[PDB]
């Protein structure tokens, strides 16, 4: 309860950690720790009745967030781990169920059958992109196919639980916590050309309430980099 | 020199052989390893995780996320069928495209048991009771609440716990996992009544496969 890191502090009370490993350290690298290990709270999204889902690309959502956005442009390479806190706050009269998963290397498919999606439509800079519950048209040039029952990757949406996941059920649970190590082939990669993780939030059983209650339940995502090291002189 | 004598089956190319092969690029000094997390040693370790079962197909929910939810509402009849699906293997049933059923369409002989986890994704003030009757292979499907109670069953109270685990064998009639209303959904004022139920499936960890083949989920 009431953990602190750097100059930021959140309040907690079960944590699922990666593929069984904890994030740890390894020309020559430098390791900065006093100015990157803090909780960058992304701003809150709203969960309405006919909502579909959200996704963030992970070393892209912190590209403008303070000093971590400066070390992405100054240093060429780097490798980090992450620690994700998700918590939505509803009363005892709401109902629903989320799925918080963290997909590594989530390559998405374009709407047009021949092209590839552009940069502005894969990742919103510190802003959540949205799935849809209908199809995306074929006639538009280059946009991400966001049919939520195929999860944008051409896969079954039910089988997405093989990745490290955690259920948020508003009857009994309220929050979720994930710890993800660095999963890549090369031991140190670029941070602009590549997005090695993807955090997805999908509502399976949709929100429902009576007449009178507040018609939206906000979600809060809080990310903190762990054991980061860059490469340069 | 040394006298040899070639047997039949000498200059043939068997596609499933195992012989020492000449290397094309020697003196290469190959790239060494690196400890990447999440190594898979056996394909059963994919099937041990739990996956949501599309138990609500009905021809208009297959292109949506309502394929995974079972509608539960407070009706007026006492004793009614909530759902029911056979365990007949691969014959267009609901365990076909799940993560358990997608590995077991690569093999032709398999045997084991199955964990079946349910979960009540409803309000926190709503209560009720459910039967989970499992009929063995050979016996018929129960056509009533009373003769579903006489078979093997587990009564699931929603108010105390919100997840009921049921273990059941599955072999290559084969059984039914029908579920019945015991009482209605009693709910207070200013709460919605239409609650939904998710269903999970897994492998019970002692099951084997044999005789690999190719999958029929292709052109």
């Amino acid at each position, epitope marked *: 309860r009431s953990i602190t890191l750097g100059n930021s502090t959140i309040t907690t009370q079960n944590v699922v950690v990666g593929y069984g490993v904890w994030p740890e350290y390894l020309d020559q690298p430098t390791q900065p720790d006093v100015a990157t290990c803090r909780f960058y709270t992304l701003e809150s999204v709203q969960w309405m009745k006919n909502s579909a889902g959200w996704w963030w690309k992970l070393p892209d959502a912190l590209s403008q967030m303070g000093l971590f956005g400066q070390n992405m442009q100054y240093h060429y390479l780097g490798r980090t781990g992450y620690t994700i806190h998700v918590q939505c706050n509803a009363s005892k009269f709401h109902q629903g169920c989320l799925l918080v998963v963290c997909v590594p290397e989530a390559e998405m498919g374009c709407s047009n059958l021949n092209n590839t999606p552009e940069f502005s439509e894969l990742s919103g800079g510190d802003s959540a992109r949205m799935f849809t519950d209908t199809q995306v048209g074929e006639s538009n040039a280059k946009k991400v196919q966001t049919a939520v029952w195929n999860a944008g990757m051409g896969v079954g949406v039910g089988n997405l639980t093989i990745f490290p996941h955690q259920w948020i059920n508003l009857r009994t649970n309220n929050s979720a916590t994930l710890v993800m190590p660095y999963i890549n082939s090369v031991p140190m990669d670029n941070m602009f050309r590549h997005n090695n993780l993807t955090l997805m939030i999908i509502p399976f059983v949709p929100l429902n309430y009576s007449e009178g209650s507040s018609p939206y339940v906000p979600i809060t995502v809080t990310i903190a980099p762990m054991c980061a090291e860059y490469n340069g002189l | 020199g040394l006298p040899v004598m070639t047997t039949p089956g000498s200059t043939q190319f068997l596609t499933s052989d195992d012989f020492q092969s000449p290397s094309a690029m020697p003196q290469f000094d190959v790239t060494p390893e690196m400890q990447i997390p999440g190594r898979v040693n056996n394909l059963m370790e994919i099937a041990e995780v739990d996956s949501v079962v599309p138990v609500n197909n009905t021809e*208009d929910n297959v292109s949506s996320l309502k394929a995974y939810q079972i509608p539960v509402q407070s009706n007026s009849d006492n004793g009614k069928q909530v759902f029911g699906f056979p365990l007949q293997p691969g014959a267009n049933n609901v365990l076909n495209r799940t993560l358990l059923g997608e590995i077991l369409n690569y093999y032709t002989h398999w045997s084991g048991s199955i964990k079946l986890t349910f979960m009540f994704c409803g309000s926190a003030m709503a209560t009720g009771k459910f039967l989970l009757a499992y009929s063995p292979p050979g016996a018929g499907v129960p056509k009533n609440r009373k003769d579903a109670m006489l078979g093997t069953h587990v009564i699931w109270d929603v108010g105390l716990q919100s997840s009921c685990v049921l273990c059941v064998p599955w072999i290559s009639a084969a059984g039914y996992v029908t579920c019945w209303y015991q009482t209605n959904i009693v709910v207070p004022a200013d709460v919605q009544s239409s609650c939904d139920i998710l269903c999970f499936v897994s492998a019970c960890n002692d099951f084997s496969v044999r005789m690999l083949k190719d999958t029929p989920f292709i052109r």
Partner: antibody, heavy 124, light 107 residues
């Protein structure tokens, strides 16, 4: 009750521009998909494009023939719906409707239940 | 994908049982085919959605059926207010194509 009126039609030169407007009353405007269906003089109907509700990000999906020429948008303050037309040709003389969509189950079938009274646009 | 209705003009006396068809070029799913009814000089109205379900406020004489690539709408008893034009709609990919139209003239 669902009450949809639309206005803005009239005569306009080929190669010109014209902006229609469809007003909605009697329901929550930020919850339903809003379509646009035109129809020539006693012929078969044609579909133009719709605009999604607030829970899906207010995106648009035009048809193939009017892609780049027409533009569907809504106004943030009050409940009103627009359609910005550009580079009109002789075959765009039709009667324009303003339909609503709804969720039947929790699914979205592609039906159009409530239609407007229909405005007319001619070119010459 | 195109829809071809048949027949274009169809006449029926009051009291008989009549039917029309709506044929697609490719396979259209059964939950994405709807029927409309437009009277003379009025806005169209939704009649049958998801190929077998009645709309709100429609009489119970109408009933749709069919699957695959051939669908049909049959009227049990013809009355005096159901003389109009009927369209069928589909969706397999964008765009949403309407049918040609079947006109029902009373006898």
């Amino acid at each position: 009750e669902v009450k949809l009126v639309e206005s803005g039609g009239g005569l306009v030169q080929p190669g010109g521009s014209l902006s229609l407007s469809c007003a909605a009353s009697g329901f929550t405007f930020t919850d339903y998909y809003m379509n646009w269906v035109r129809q020539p003089s006693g012929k078969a109907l044609e579909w133009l494009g719709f605009l999604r509700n607030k829970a899906n990000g207010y995106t648009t999906e035009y048809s193939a023939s009017v892609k780049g020429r027409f533009t569907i948008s809504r106004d943030n303050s009050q409940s009103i719906l627009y359609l910005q037309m550009n580079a009109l040709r002789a075959e765009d003389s039709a009667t324009y409707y303003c339909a609503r969509s709804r969720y039947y189950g929790g699914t979205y079938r592609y039906a159009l239940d409530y239609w407007g009274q229909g405005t007319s646009v001619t070119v010459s | 994908n195109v829809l071809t209705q048949s027949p274009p003009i169809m006449s029926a006396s009051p009291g008989e049982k009549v039917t029309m068809t709506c044929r697609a070029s490719s396979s259209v799913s059964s939950s994405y085919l709807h029927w409309y009814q437009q009277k003379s000089g009025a806005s169209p109205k939704l009649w049958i959605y998801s190929t077998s379900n009645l709309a709100s406020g429609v009489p119970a004489r109408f009933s749709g059926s069919g699957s695959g690539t051939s669908y049909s709408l049959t009227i049990s008893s013809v009355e005096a207010e159901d003389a109009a034009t009927y369209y069928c709609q589909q969706f397999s990919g964008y765009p949403l194509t309407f049918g040609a139209g079947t006109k029902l003239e009373l006898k």
